[PDB]
Amino acid sequence: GGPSFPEPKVVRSQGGLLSLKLSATPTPLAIAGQRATLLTYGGSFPGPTLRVRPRDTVRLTLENRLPEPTNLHWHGLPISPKVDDPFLEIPPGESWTYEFTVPKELAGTFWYHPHLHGRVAPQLFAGLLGALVVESSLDAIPELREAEEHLLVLKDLALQGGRPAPHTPMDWMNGKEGDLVLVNGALRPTLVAQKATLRLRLLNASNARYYRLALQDHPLYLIAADGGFLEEPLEVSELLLAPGERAEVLVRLRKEGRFLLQALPYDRGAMGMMDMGGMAHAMPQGPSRPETLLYLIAPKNPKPLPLPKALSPFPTLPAPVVTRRLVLTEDMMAARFFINGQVFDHRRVDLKGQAQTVEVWEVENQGDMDHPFHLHVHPFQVLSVGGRPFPYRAWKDVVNLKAGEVARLLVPLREKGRTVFHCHIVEHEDRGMMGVLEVG
Ligand SMILES: [Cu+2]
Ligand SMILES: [Cu+2]
């Protein structure tokens, strides 16, 4: 219908159930004017979008048709770590059925991807990822109902010989970024808007690339973070999305025209090669070059909707019972990454907490790179970074830490069981930067 825009196929719950068999398989596909064989869920890159409502039952059978073992992480879903099991291994040729109920208060954009320790970064870079959208009753208010909605999966790629490029020694240190900077698997698509207000769900599913998002001539109005709505729209001139983060923004198209959505230059502290360089700064890579992500064409004679005056009030959380300190460190040349001086050991429990309590977590980046900290299973509220207040109230599950920054997080502990926390530059996770939390 009308102009086409590349976007993943959507699978929706029906009568309160989303039952779906999803195969993880090598798949030859068309991509950026060539043919490449990626690893995909459901024969597509990105994988299919699962769309559900609160209280729905999800029954996803993952069919491993890969040459190596794999599993799934249900990124951002506050469900049982016995379902969202970071230690599970599904051998090649076997299947596993994940069954869970969507929590009643949940809303926003989530995603799924591999979490088999040691193999995350190659598997995710090869194409294995998809989005999960939880609908909200709030989507029925006129200021959002009549917006034109789209998912934008931000995911870069690099190809060599018609397959995902191999990880190099520098990739294990810096995280791998690709030369093909894609939106929904397409190179610089064009979105011909048919409404003047857009609602864009944004997902950074890249291994390591950061997207400093800016739309030409337009602010963004942030209405949702990783794990739920803000309390009211927040206008920003630009929006930094670290790996694993999601956001939902409203765009209000004022004038006709063609506007670029760009990822503006951002320096995440990646390191370059040789120790010599010209004479200035020798071996930091420096800021990313700007990238055009997509072209946005405004409709004829645009008149946008008013912004909603309110969204979702954020629950007051109880007083915390424990303070934890988690210090991130790195040894760049060995490409090894630590939390409180240790690398991940799946046989080691690093933190022991109580169900139905709130903790404060102080996460300190004592490295020189940005590290985006992710905690499975338990969404958190960011109170402050660097001793200054966070700009909004919303559930998050990834918080970006620049070099030297300390984040203070309010972490309500929900489901019992053993789960993990890790950097979501997934190369760093594979090379050490993960620990184990047990709730009882
Ligand atoms: Cu994730
Ligand atoms: Cu990291």
UniProtKB/TrEMBL annotation:
Lineage: Bacteria, Thermotogati, Deinococcota, Deinococci, Thermales
Entry keyword annotation includes 4Fe-4S: no
Binding-site list for Cu(2+) 2: 75, 113, 424
GO molecular function: copper ion binding; hydroquinone:oxygen oxidoreductase activity
Organism of origin: Thermus thermophilus (strain ATCC BAA-163 / DSM 7039 / HB27)
Enzyme nomenclature, EC number: 1.10.3.2
Annotated binding of Cu(2+) 3, by residue: 115, 376, 422
Ranges of residues in domain Plastocyanin-like: 31-137, 173-264, 325-439
CDD domains listed in its UniProt record: CuRO_1_Tth-MCO_like, CuRO_2_McoC_like, CuRO_3_Tth-MCO_like
PROSITE patterns the record matches: MULTICOPPER_OXIDASE2 (PS00080)
Signal found in the keyword field: no
Catalytic class of the enzyme: oxidoreductase
Gene3D superfamilies reported in the protein's UniProt record: Cupredoxins - blue copper proteins (2.60.40.420)
Protein name, as recorded: Laccase
Binding-site positions, Cu(2+) 5: 371, 423, 428
Pfam families: Cu-oxidase, Cu-oxidase_2, Cu-oxidase_3
Binding-site residues for Cu(2+) 4, renumbered to this chain: 281
Residues bound to Cu(2+) 6: 376, 422
Keyword tags: Metal-binding, Oxidoreductase
Annotated residues for binding of Cu(2+) 1: 73, 374
InterPro entries: Cu-oxidase-like_N, Cu-oxidase_2nd, Cu-oxidase_C, Cu-oxidase_fam, Cu_oxidase_Cu_BS, Cupredoxin
